[PDB]
Design a binder for these strands. Structure first.
Ligand SMILES: [Mg+2]
Ligand SMILES: [Mg+2]
Ligand SMILES: [Mg+2]
Ligand SMILES: [Mg+2]
Ligand SMILES: [Mg+2]
Ligand SMILES: [Mg+2]
Ligand SMILES: [Mg+2]
Ligand SMILES: [Mg+2]
Ligand SMILES: [Mg+2]
Ligand SMILES: [Mg+2]
Ligand SMILES: [Mg+2]
Ligand SMILES: [Mg+2]
Ligand SMILES: [Mg+2]
Ligand SMILES: [Mg+2]
Ligand SMILES: [Mg+2]
Ligand SMILES: [Mg+2]
Ligand SMILES: [Mg+2]
Ligand SMILES: [Mg+2]
Ligand SMILES: [Mg+2]
Ligand SMILES: [Mg+2]
Ligand SMILES: [Mg+2]
Ligand SMILES: [Mg+2]
Ligand SMILES: [Mg+2]
Ligand SMILES: [Mg+2]
Ligand SMILES: [Mg+2]
Ligand SMILES: [Mg+2]
Ligand SMILES: [Mg+2]
Ligand SMILES: [Mg+2]
Ligand SMILES: [Mg+2]
Ligand SMILES: [Mg+2]
Ligand SMILES: [Mg+2]
Ligand SMILES: [Mg+2]
Ligand SMILES: [Mg+2]
Ligand SMILES: [Mg+2]
Ligand SMILES: [Mg+2]
Ligand SMILES: [Mg+2]
Ligand SMILES: [Mg+2]
Ligand SMILES: [Mg+2]
Ligand SMILES: [Mg+2]
Ligand SMILES: [Mg+2]
Ligand SMILES: [Mg+2]
Ligand SMILES: [Mg+2]
Ligand SMILES: [Mg+2]
Ligand SMILES: [Mg+2]
Ligand SMILES: [Mg+2]
Ligand SMILES: [Mg+2]
Ligand SMILES: [Mg+2]
Ligand SMILES: [Mg+2]
Ligand SMILES: [Mg+2]
Ligand SMILES: [Mg+2]
Ligand SMILES: [Mg+2]
Ligand SMILES: [Mg+2]
Ligand SMILES: [Mg+2]
Ligand SMILES: [Mg+2]
Ligand SMILES: [Mg+2]
Ligand SMILES: [Mg+2]
Ligand SMILES: [Mg+2]
Ligand SMILES: [Mg+2]
Ligand SMILES: [Zn+2]
Lengths: 105, 58, 205, 159
RNA sequence: CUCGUAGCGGUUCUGACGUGCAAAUCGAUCGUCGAAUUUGGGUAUAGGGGCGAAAGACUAAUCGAACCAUCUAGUAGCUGGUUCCUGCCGAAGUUUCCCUCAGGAUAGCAGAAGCUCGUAUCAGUUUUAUGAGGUAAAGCGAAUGAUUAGAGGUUCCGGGGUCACCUUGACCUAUUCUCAAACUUUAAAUAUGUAAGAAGUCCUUGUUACUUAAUUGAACGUGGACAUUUGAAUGAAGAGCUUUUAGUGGGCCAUUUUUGGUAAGCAGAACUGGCGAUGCGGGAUGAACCGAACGUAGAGUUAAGGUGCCGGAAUACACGCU
RNA sequence: CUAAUUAAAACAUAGCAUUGCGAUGGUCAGAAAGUGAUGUUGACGCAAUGUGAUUUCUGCCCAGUGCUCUGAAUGUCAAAGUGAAGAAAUUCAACCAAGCGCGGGUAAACGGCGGGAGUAACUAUGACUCUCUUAAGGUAGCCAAAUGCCUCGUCAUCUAA
RNA sequence: ACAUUGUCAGGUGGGGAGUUUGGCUGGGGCGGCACAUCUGUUAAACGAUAACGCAGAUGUCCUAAGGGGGGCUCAUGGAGAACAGAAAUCUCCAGUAGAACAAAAGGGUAAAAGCCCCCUUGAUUUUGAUUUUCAGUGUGAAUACAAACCAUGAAAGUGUGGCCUAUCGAUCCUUUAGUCCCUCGGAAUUUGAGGCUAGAGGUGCCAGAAAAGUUACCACAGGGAUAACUGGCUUGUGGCAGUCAAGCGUUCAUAGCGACAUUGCUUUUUGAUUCUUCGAUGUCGGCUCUUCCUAUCAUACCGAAGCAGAAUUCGGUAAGCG
RNA sequence: GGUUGCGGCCAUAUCUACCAGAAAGCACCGUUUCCCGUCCGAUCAACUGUAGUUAAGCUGGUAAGAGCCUGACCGAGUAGUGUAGUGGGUGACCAUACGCGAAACUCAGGUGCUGCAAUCU
């Protein structure tokens, strides 16, 4: 899946409130950040005996994750989050479809 | 065990023991589902009708 | 080795022919449907004698071939192979299944059958009027190869046509009758007059 | 497994009515729908947007909402032991007027008209419709028409 | 080491007995009989422990985990049972979700309590008008796809036979026989949607920020016109509404149309009627068939079925057949 | 030895072999102990196993997994300790023991022990040979055996069968 | 001043402990997914409708294969061009779609929905309404609006992803975007944490537990809701019959036979129901002993022969007796 | 009545062959500086109705035309189907009773109608 890395979408930036240009990056999660409350509760609950308390999930079934485009307005730096479908490949760069050219390999 | 999966035998006897009702229409339906532009004007087209009715009677 | 003809005798399931979902149909064993002097003209054989089913059933492809052999063998040994035109007017298109404890029961194709209505013609023999009792006994022996009950109806048509013997005659001194390979073409009051002249020119005299 | 999609079992129903494929003729787009008009739902397969679900093909209902290209139609749907009000957003090329309601509304104009000369004279003009009443007396003549038929025919096979 | 007593074991009769003499005996026949023998007393090892020349054997008739008491009335979607009478009403074995499929929840079916009112609004029905359907049938010299047989049309489309020929293949044109659950121009019956008016129709013209080039349209109105033949038929047993709650959520049969299966008192569907939950008359007998559904009695008449005798009722009448 | 349905081919056995241990020890107890068994002991001992008298032999395999090794030392390496930034809670980085990974030894440790094709002056048989994968490709022996489905294999013997 | 000891941290640790090992199922096991889906059929012309029914497809692909505009006609056939033929390009005629539209199938489409070109990001923001599955919950998909903001085109218009019908996911936790908004409860500042609105990360057993085996030592609650033995139904198969007669039988269908067909019989063979039996109907063979059937091996009496005799073979009555 | 522009229903209008068209409109037709587009003024754009023509388009007629459309007591009250019986039949199926009722075929007839505007010996 090919997505352009520059987009003209609506901005909820309270100054644009219109279609502006957006620079587009793919969204990655970010680190778990200990001292989150559910992580501190995880630390106090695993201590002692009896072992694992919360479930440890195993039967994963998806070959894919939905890709989230993490946009940013070029004018007011107000960011957006768009979501696409499941895809085994996600290409953010260029390499557009040249039509009348000979195949190879 | 092996079980009878599905049948609609006896389902219309129960459907008629309490007598199927048509949905009991009313004068003045709800304006949910109307074109919101039309409903928006209809608030004013009936407000001013009441002003021209209430002032003309008094 | 084969299930008897009483097993699939009655029509209990729908017509199940050979197409893009069956794909594995075992072929029939009646593959000849016209017999005798099939290239005789219409006028040589004026007398159509029929085998007609009085019961709604299935004739099998084995049975239609076996009755064809028996009826052909009698008529040639009495009057010869150019004294009749035996036409089997029945084609076995219906495919029968077979299952081979009750699980995965859906079947694999077994044999070919031919659904015949009450009043449907099985066989038709056209011949001369002198050879009539030969043809009946040739068809009377062919009854034994068939389940159900079959009738020997002397038709009133002229041969293998759809018009009666005197109706075919008044069309014959008149010019609406002319030969083809196996059958006879007829004249109409319709179409272009030039094509009514190209073919059929003995008319308009 | 089993398939229960939106256009399931709609093979012949959404088909396009032999030798009448192609574009929608323009009288469909010139028809005028008002709220309260009673319309017959028949989906045109060549228009895939605004297309009713297969339950509503042939159903008849009342226009309640009017948008740019679509009417809002109310259909009564039997669900279990009662009917529920179904509100459908269908474009006007799946929709025609019910010709019965044109036949009704002229009879309303007729019964208004027939009661007018009931007010000139002769009250109770008997304007209600009646069923096919039994026939009256006849006297059937025989002049040129003497009664003749023969008997039942015998059995012939006529093949 | 050997034969063989006492002893100590326990092979076979698969003996007796098998409510015994006996919760392991009795009898015969057997193994072994001077040692890794047999045995008394003392002593040690204790239950998830001991002990085991090892069989999960033995550890007080208890052993793949002793016995006693407590926690403990442990838990049970499983089986049994659940105690007086009469009256009235009266089911379900189906929906959706659930580590759900012997169970729940949820909707449906049922009862009760009523409440607001008083024949409105309706209806497992018809008629009239108006749609929708692609099934049965029909069709294949109509398309797609099968399939039968001859006709007419001459080509390095490799027909060998000249180096224009009896012994050409297909192809095209007109015919012909036979067909289709996943083919079709057509197209039923049955079933199905809507309408058949006062919340209506008509006239006048009031409002609006919607809409129009334009009070034009749209929607809702004021005022006025029409009264029960007020806009088909038949019925209506009161209509409408609310709350709460039980059981059920194993089904089965028959007619018709069905899928699978050679077939089934088979496995699965659809519509209806039944049984379950139901007696009564008939089918000798039978959950389901036929007739008909039930307070206690009397009289009459019937149903389905019968009327030689059992057995109430004509060894009736009639025409034949065997 | 299965008391009370199995007395046996099962268990034991001598013989054989393997393994661990020189006492601050091996093997095992115990909640701990200034606590125990072996042990009133000391490798001709004690402990842990396997096979099971004698005759005659115990082939090939260390790739797997276990066991073992004064073996390799920036692959991984927890806690403590060290350092940087921050106001600090904290974040990061370096260092990083055992153990794992790496290398090796061990089969009387657990265990394993092959196909297709053509070839001898017979027709196929196949000493030898060509590949596929091995760590090794079942040696010595023995056998329709208490181990072989086919199988009541084939032959001989026993019998009239 | 090292072992030892106390505490903590990494390893080792079935020696010991506890727990887990889904469901549907013509019994369970096995295989498969009918477990969440789509198209056509099943499915019987509204809708709905089962089977481990049938034929296929789903967990993708796409910045264009999305949006708009303009121009053009596609499969294929015929005739024509040097190499060049059966297939290279070129030109005309015929071409209702016989092509193509990402992917199955069905439907739809001819100045287009297809082919070529130009411009673009509407595959956008915000809140409701609606349709299907349906409890009228959720999820997914979709339809019509409305407020914006854009694309596009001359414009009317069209666009809230793919021409339509499938292509997907709760609480808790983590993360990101938004406001720079609420709180940290003695009062503040700064980090830090918590909060609100919208997405992501995932439960495919797809409304979503965190889980390897075996039991012949097994045990308990039940279950004929369930496998075997029997009885009963059904009868593929097994056997036994019959009709027809192409042929065999030196000639000659039928003395005796008999193909291709066809119609039945048996429940003693073998297959299908899980109907009855799980608070147990004692499971094979044999021995012993009785009776019954006749589809007759012998014996009695017969008929036929391709019956000279002798011996056979076909058939009848017949189960009295072996 | 013809014709043109815009249409409605979308073959009674389509397709095949041959023949006619007065006026008018429409068309073919002439040219390429401009606007514009192409490999190429054939398409498209632009220009003058100027050089000419009904040859084509187009309209209409002809055709025992093909097709399409309408009707039929044409098939045919047929096939099918709803409902009923302790009807028939071993069954397959069938007959009757009260209803509903085709299609193919076959004959007959037809071959655009019409709206708004504008013009035409
Ligand atoms: Mg059930
Ligand atoms: Mg479907
Ligand atoms: Mg001794
Ligand atoms: Mg001794
Ligand atoms: Mg002794
Ligand atoms: Mg013993
Ligand atoms: Mg005994
Ligand atoms: Mg006693
Ligand atoms: Mg001795
Ligand atoms: Mg003693
Ligand atoms: Mg223990
Ligand atoms: Mg054991
Ligand atoms: Mg105890
Ligand atoms: Mg208890
Ligand atoms: Mg009652
Ligand atoms: Mg679900
Ligand atoms: Mg349940
Ligand atoms: Mg129970
Ligand atoms: Mg109730
Ligand atoms: Mg159809
Ligand atoms: Mg049919
Ligand atoms: Mg069907
Ligand atoms: Mg129907
Ligand atoms: Mg339930
Ligand atoms: Mg139950
Ligand atoms: Mg079937
Ligand atoms: Mg009862
Ligand atoms: Mg009766
Ligand atoms: Mg009774
Ligand atoms: Mg009886
Ligand atoms: Mg009787
Ligand atoms: Mg009394
Ligand atoms: Mg009497
Ligand atoms: Mg014993
Ligand atoms: Mg000691
Ligand atoms: Mg060895
Ligand atoms: Mg550390
Ligand atoms: Mg060897
Ligand atoms: Mg269908
Ligand atoms: Mg349907
Ligand atoms: Mg396919
Ligand atoms: Mg998928
Ligand atoms: Mg264009
Ligand atoms: Mg596609
Ligand atoms: Mg397709
Ligand atoms: Mg979904
Ligand atoms: Mg939770
Ligand atoms: Mg505080
Ligand atoms: Mg925060
Ligand atoms: Mg689920
Ligand atoms: Mg019991
Ligand atoms: Mg006999
Ligand atoms: Mg005898
Ligand atoms: Mg005899
Ligand atoms: Mg007897
Ligand atoms: Mg006897
Ligand atoms: Mg020019
Ligand atoms: Mg009845
Ligand atoms: Zn911005």
């Amino acid at each position: 899946v090919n997505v352009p890395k520059t987009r003209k979408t609506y901005c909820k930036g309270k100054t644009c409130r219109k279609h502006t240009q957006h620079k587009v990056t793919q969204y990655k999660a970010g680190k778990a950040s200990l001292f989150a409350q559910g992580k501190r509760r995880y630390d106090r609950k695993q201590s002692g005996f009896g072992g694992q308390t919360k479930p440890v999930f195993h039967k994963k079934a998806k070959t894919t994750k939905k890709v989230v485009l993490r946009l940013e307005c070029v004018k007011c730096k107000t960011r957006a989050q768009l979501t696409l479908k499941r895809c085994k490949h996600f290409e953010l760069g260029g390499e557009k479809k040249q039509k009348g050219q000979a195949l190879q390999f | 065990a092996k079980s009878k999966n599905h049948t609609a035998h006896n389902q219309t006897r129960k459907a008629h023991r309490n007598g199927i009702k048509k949905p009991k229409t009313y004068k003045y339906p709800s304006l949910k589902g109307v074109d919101p532009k039309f409903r928006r004007n209809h608030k004013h087209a009936l407000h001013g009708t009441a002003k021209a009715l209430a002032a003309a009677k008094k | 080795a084969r299930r008897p003809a009483r097993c699939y005798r009655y029509q209990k399931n729908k017509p199940y022919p050979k197409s893009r979902y069956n794909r594995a149909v075992p072929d029939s064993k009646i593959r000849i449907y016209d017999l005798g002097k099939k290239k005789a003209t219409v006028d040589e054989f004026p007398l159509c004698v029929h085998l007609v089913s009085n019961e709604l059933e299935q004739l099998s492809s084995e049975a239609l071939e076996a009755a064809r052999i028996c009826a052909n063998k009698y008529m040639t040994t009495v009057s010869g192979r150019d004294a009749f035109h035996l036409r089997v007017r029945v084609h076995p298109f219906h495919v029968l299944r077979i299952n081979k404890g009750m699980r995965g029961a859906w079947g694999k194709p077994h044999g070919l059958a031919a659904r015949v209505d009450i009043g449907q013609i099985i066989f038709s023999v056209r011949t001369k009027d002198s050879n009539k009792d030969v043809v009946v006994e040739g068809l009377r022996r062919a009854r034994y190869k068939f389940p159900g009950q079959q009738k020997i109806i002397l038709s009133k048509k002229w041969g293998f046509t759809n018009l009666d013997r005197p109706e075919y005659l008044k069309k014959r001194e008149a010019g609406e009758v002319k030969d083809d390979g196996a059958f006879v073409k007829f004249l109409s009051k319709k179409g272009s007059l030039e094509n009514n002249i190209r073919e059929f020119p003995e008319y308009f005299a | 497994g089993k398939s229960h999609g939106y256009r399931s079992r709609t093979r012949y129903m959404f088909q396009r009515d032999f030798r009448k494929h192609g574009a929608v003729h323009l009288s469909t787009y010139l028809k005028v729908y008002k709220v309260g008009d009673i319309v017959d739902i028949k989906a045109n397969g060549s228009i895939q947007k605004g297309m009713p679900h297969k339950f509503y093909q042939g159903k008849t209902g009342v226009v309640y909402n009017v948008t740019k290209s679509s009417v809002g139609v109310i259909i009564n749907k039997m669900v279990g032991n009662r009917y529920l009000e179904k509100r459908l957003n269908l474009r006007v090329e799946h929709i025609k007027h019910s010709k019965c309601r044109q036949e009704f509304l002229e009879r309303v104009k007729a019964n208004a008209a027939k009661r007018a000369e009931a007010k000139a004279q002769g009250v109770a003009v008997q304007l209600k419709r009646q069923p096919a009443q039994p026939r009256e007396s006849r006297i059937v003549s025989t002049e040129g028409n003497v009664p003749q038929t023969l008997a039942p025919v015998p059995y012939e096979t006529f093949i």
